[PDB]
Amino acid sequence: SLTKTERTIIVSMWAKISTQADTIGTETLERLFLSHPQTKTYFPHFDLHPGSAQLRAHGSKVVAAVGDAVKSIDDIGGALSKLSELHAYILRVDPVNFKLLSHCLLVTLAARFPADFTAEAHAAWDKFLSVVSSVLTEKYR
Amino acid sequence: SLTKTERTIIVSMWAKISTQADTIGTETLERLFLSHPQTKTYFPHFDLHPGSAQLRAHGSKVVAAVGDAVKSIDDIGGALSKLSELHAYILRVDPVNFKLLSHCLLVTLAARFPADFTAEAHAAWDKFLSVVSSVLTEKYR
Amino acid sequence: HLTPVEKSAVTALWGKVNVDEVGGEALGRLLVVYPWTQRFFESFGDLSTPDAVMGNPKVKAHGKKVLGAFSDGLAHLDNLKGTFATLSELHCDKLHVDPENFRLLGNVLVCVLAHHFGKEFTPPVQAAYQKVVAGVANALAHKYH
Amino acid sequence: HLTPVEKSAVTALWGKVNVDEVGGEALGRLLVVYPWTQRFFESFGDLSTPDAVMGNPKVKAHGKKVLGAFSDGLAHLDNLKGTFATLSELHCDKLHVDPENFRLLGNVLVCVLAHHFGKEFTPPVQAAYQKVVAGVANALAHKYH
Ligand code: HEM
Ligand code: HEM
Numbered sequence: 089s090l091t092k093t094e095r096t097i098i099v100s101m102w103a104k105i106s107t108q109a110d111t112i113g114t115e116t117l118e119r120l121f122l123s124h125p126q127t128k129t130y131f132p133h134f135d136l137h138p139g140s141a142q143l144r145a146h147g148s149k150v151v152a153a154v155g156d157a158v159k160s161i162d163d164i165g166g167a168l169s170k171l172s173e174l175h176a177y178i179l180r181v182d183p184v185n186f187k188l189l190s191h192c193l194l195v196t197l198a199a200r201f202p203a204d205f206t207a208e209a210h211a212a213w214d215k216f217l218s219v220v221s222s223v224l225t226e227k228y229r
Numbered sequence: 230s231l232t233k234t235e236r237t238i239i240v241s242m243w244a245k246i247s248t249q250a251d252t253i254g255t256e257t258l259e260r261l262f263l264s265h266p267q268t269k270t271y272f273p274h275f276d277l278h279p280g281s282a283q284l285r286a287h288g289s290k291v292v293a294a295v296g297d298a299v300k301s302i303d304d305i306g307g308a309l310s311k312l313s314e315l316h317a318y319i320l321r322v323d324p325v326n327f328k329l330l331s332h333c334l335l336v337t338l339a340a341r342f343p344a345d346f347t348a349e350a351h352a353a354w355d356k357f358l359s360v361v362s363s364v365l366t367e368k369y370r
Numbered sequence: 371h372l373t374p375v376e377k378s379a380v381t382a383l384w385g386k387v388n389v390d391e392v393g394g395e396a397l398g399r400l401l402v403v404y405p406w407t408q409r410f411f412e413s414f415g416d417l418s419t420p421d422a423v424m425g426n427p428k429v430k431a432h433g434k435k436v437l438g439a440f441s442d443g444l445a446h447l448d449n450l451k452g453t454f455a456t457l458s459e460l461h462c463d464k465l466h467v468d469p470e471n472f473r474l475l476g477n478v479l480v481c482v483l484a485h486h487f488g489k490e491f492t493p494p495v496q497a498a499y500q501k502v503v504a505g506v507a508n509a510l511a512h513k514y515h
Numbered sequence: 516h517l518t519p520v521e522k523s524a525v526t527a528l529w530g531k532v533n534v535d536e537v538g539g540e541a542l543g544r545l546l547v548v549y550p551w552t553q554r555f556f557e558s559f560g561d562l563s564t565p566d567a568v569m570g571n572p573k574v575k576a577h578g579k580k581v582l583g584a585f586s587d588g589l590a591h592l593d594n595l596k597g598t599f600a601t602l603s604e605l606h607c608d609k610l611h612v613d614p615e616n617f618r619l620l621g622n623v624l625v626c627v628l629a630h631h632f633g634k635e636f637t638p639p640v641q642a643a644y645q646k647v648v649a650g651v652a653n654a655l656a657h658k659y660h
C-alpha cells in the first residue's frame with residue numbers, strides 16, 4: 089500500500105496520463121525493448137520492432153491495466169488477480185523484467201510531464217509500480 | 230508457507246544441521262564473503278577474512294535464526310519479526326544479497342549432507358530460504 | 371560497445387547538459403526515491419522531506435562532483451575500469467557502498483536526462499545512455515574486494 | 516579474470532568430474548528446483564515429479580551436452596563470447612530463453628560440484644567456479660538482440 093501524499097500523486101498523474109495513454113504505452117515498450125532486448129524473449133511471436141501495430145496495441149493494454157491498479161489502488165492485488173495468474177503461473181515472467189519495465193515507464197513519464205515529475209512524484213510512482221510488479225510476480229521467486 | 234512434505238524435509242535436515250551448526254554458519258559466510266566480496270560492505274567494522282573469530286561468531290547467529298524459522302516453520306514471518314525489522318528498517322540490506330547468502334548455504338548443505346541433499350530436498354531448501362529471505366527484506370524494494 | 375550513432379548521440383546531448391544542476395538533481399532524486407541511501411550522507415543535514423533534499427546545498431555540490439565523474443567516463447568509454455579504479459576502491463574501502471546502489475544512481479540519472487530533454491531523449495538515445503550508465507556502474511564495482 | 520591459482524583449481528577439479536552424469540544432475544535439479552524451466556523441455560517426456568526428472572534419459576543426455584559446453588568454456592576462459600556466440604544466438608532466436616535463467620543453471624551446477632566433491636569444494640574453489648559460471652552466463656547472453 090501507499091500513503092496519502094503518494095496515492096494522491098498517483099491519482100493526479102493518472103489524470104494526465106489518461107489522455108495520452110496510447111502513446112505513453114507505446115513509448116514505454118519501445119524504450120524497454122530497445123534498452124533491454126532480452127525482455128523480448130517473452131513475446132516470441134510478436135513483432136516488437138519500433139512502430140509496429142502489435143507493439144502499440146500491447147502498450148495500450150499495459151497502460152490500461154496500470155489504470156485498473158490506479159482505480160483500485162486501495163486493493164491492487166484484488167483488482168489484478170487474473171493478470172497476476174497470467175504473469176506468475178502462466179508466463180512465469182522473471183521478477184527482474186518488471187523492474188526494467190517500471191524504469192522505462194518512469195523515463196517516459198519524466199519526459200512527458202516534466203513539471204509534475206518532481207522527486208516526490210518520481211518516488212511515489214517508483215513505489216506504486218513496485219507494488220504493481222509484486223502483485224504480478226510469482227511470490228518468492 | 231511450505232508444503233507438508235517440504236516442511237518435513239526442512240525439519241529432518243535441520244536435525245542434522247543442528248549438531249554442526251557452528252561450522253555450517255561459518256562455512257556459509259566464508260563462501261559468501263569470498264564468492265561475493267561486495268557483500269562485505271554491510272560489515273564495515275567486522276574482520277571478515279577467512280578464519281576470523283568474528284566471522285565464525287556471526288555465522289552461528291545466522292544459523293541460529295534459520296533454526297528459529299524451522300521451529301516456527303508454519304509462521305515464519307511471525308517468528309522472525311524483530312530480525313525482519315532489523316534487516317529492513319535498520320540495516321537496509323539490498324534484496325539481491327539474500328539470494329547470494331541462500332545459494333552459499335545451499336552449497337554448504339550439498340557438500341555436508343550429500344545423501345540427504347536430493348533434488349527434492351534442494352528444492353524444499355531453496356523455497357524455505359526464499360520465504361525466509363522475503364520475510365527479512367523491505368517489502369517492494 | 372557503443373556504435374558511431376550511439377557514441378555521437380550521447381556525446382552531442384551531453385554537450386547540452388547543465389553541469390551545475392543535473393548531478394544534484396540526480397543525487398537528490400536518489401535520496402528521495404531510495405530513502406535508505408540517505409544513510410551514506412548524514413553530514414549533509416536535513417533530508418527529511420523531498421523539498422529539504424532538493425533544496426540542500428550539499429546534495430547539489432556533491433551532485434556536481436558525481437556529474438563530473440560521469441563526464442570523465444563518457445570521455446573514456448573504452449577504458450571505464452581504469453578510469454574508475456580509484457573511485458571504486460574509495461567506494462569499497464572507505465564508503466562501504468553496496469555496488470548494487472550504483473545501478474540505482476544510473477537509472478535516476480537516466481530519468482533526469484529524460485526530464486530535461488523530453489522528446490529529444492528518444493528510445494534509441496535512452497538505449498545508448500543505458501549502456502553508458504551500466505558501463506560506469508560496472509567499472510565502479512570493479513575493484514571491490 | 517581467473518588467477519593462476521583459480522584457473523588451475525577449476526581445471527584440476529574439472530578433470531575429476533564424471534562427464535556422463537554431472538550435466539544431467541545439474542539439468543535435472545534445475546527442472547526440479549525451478550519448475551517453470553520445464554516449459555522449455557516438453558519434448559523430454561515425464562518431468563512430473565523429482566524422481567521422474569532425475570531418472571529421465573533425455574534429461575541425462577541433454578545435460579551431457581550442456582556439460583560439454585561448460586567444458587568448452589573452461590578450455591577457453593579468455594574468449595567466452597566467441598566461444599558461446601552460436602549458442603547465444605540459438606538460445607535467443609530459436610529457444611527464447613530469458614538469460615536471467617542462465618544464472619540459475621550456473622548456481623545449480625555449483626551445487627552439484629559441491630555435492631560431488633564435498634570437503635574438497637572449498638570456499639576459494641567455489642569462488643573460482645562462480646567466476647566461471649557468471650562468465651559462461653554472460654557470454655551466453657551476449658548475442659541477444
Ligand atoms: C507494470 C507491469 C505490467 C503490466 C501492468 C502488464 C500488463 C499486461 C496486460 C494488460 C496484458 C494483456 C493480457 C490480456 O489481454 O489477457 C499482458 C500480457 C503480457 N505481458 Fe504483461 N504486464 C506487465 C509486465 C510484463 C513484463 C515485465 C513482461 C515481460 C517482459 C510481460 C509479459 C507479458 C506477456 C508475454 C503477455 C502476453 C502477451 C501475449 O502473448 O498475448 N508483462 N501484460
Ligand atoms: C537467511 C538470511 C539471513 C539471516 C537468517 C540473518 C540473520 C542475522 C542475525 C540473527 C543477525 C544478528 C542480529 C542480532 O545480533 O541481534 C544478523 C545481523 C546482521 N545481518 Fe543478517 N541475516 C541474513 C542475511 C543477511 C544479508 C543477506 C546481509 C547482508 C549482506 C546481512 C546483514 C546483516 C548485518 C550487517 C547484521 C548486523 C551485523 C552487526 O553489526 O553486528 N544479513 N543477521
Ligand code: HEM
Pocket residue numbers: 407410411413432435436439440457461465467471472473475476506507510
Ligand atoms: C554510480 C555512480 C557514482 C559515481 C560516479 C560516484 C562518484 C563519486 C565521487 C567522484 C565522489 C566524490 C569524490 C571527491 O570528493 O573527490 C564520491 C563520493 C561519495 N560517494 Fe559516490 N558515486 C557513485 C555512486 C554512489 C552511491 C550510489 C553512493 C551511496 C549510496 C555513493 C556514496 C558516496 C559517498 C558517501 C561519498 C563521500 C561523500 C562525502 O561525504 O563527501 N556514491 N562518489
Ligand code: HEM
Pocket residue numbers: 552555556558577580581584585602606610612616617618620621651652655
Ligand atoms: C547457462 C548454461 C547453458 C548452457 C551452457 C546451455 C547449453 C546448451 C547446448 C550445448 C544446447 C544443445 C544443443 C545440441 O544438442 O546440439 C542447448 C539447447 C537447449 N537449451 Fe540450453 N544452455 C544453457 C541454459 C539454458 C537454459 C537456462 C534453458 C532453459 C530455461 C535452456 C534451454 C535450452 C533448450 C530448450 C534447448 C533445446 C533442447 C532440445 O530440445 O533439444 N538452456 N543448450
